[PDB]
A = this chain, B = another copy of it.
Amino acid sequence: APLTITYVREKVIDFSKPFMTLGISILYRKPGVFSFLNPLSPDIWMYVLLAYLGVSVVLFVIARALSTRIVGGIWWFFTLIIISSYTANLAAFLTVERMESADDLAKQTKIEYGAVRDGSTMTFFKKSKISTYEKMWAFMSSR
């Protein structure tokens, strides 16, 4: 059967010579309207249409000059700071997901990693005394 060979279990049973050699590895997954709701909270872009139509109808009535310039001013301030905030929080989210290894994933609790029960892996580990392996042992045995 697919089995495992080490020093402790070769003194209790007999085994044939290795005929294929491999190692243990960790597996991870391979991985338009988004970013329009999370950077800044959602109710914004739903009230933003009114946040345009206000000055829209204002200058609609004004034209129907000093007043036009001073209303387009507040509108243009308006646009300045709001677009700065939007692209700001968007770039913040993007930069976070850009800035954010077995050691790295081991040292963080954001990712959960483990193994099967009663496998050879735990024997191989608890036999050893490695610092990396001891931190993985602590993480997996915890909870």
Contacts and interface: CB of A to CB of B under 8 A. Distances in A.
A44 to B, nearest CB: 9
Interface string A29-54: 00000001001100001001100100
A70 interface: yes
A94 interface: yes
A64 interface: yes
27 contacts: A39-B88, A40-B84, A45-B77, A48-B80, A49-B73, A52-B76, A56-B66, A56-B73, A59-B69, A63-B69, A77-B79, A81-B87, A83-B84, A85-B86, A86-B88, A87-B91, A88-B93, A89-B90, A90-B92, A92-B98, A95-B95, A96-B99, A99-B100, A101-B109, A103-B107, A128-B138, A130-B135
Contact of A81 (B65, B86, B96, B97): B86
Given A69-B63, A88-B87, A93 B96 contact: no
What range describes how many residues of A lie at the interface? Answer: 35 or more
Copies of this chain present in the complex amount to: 3
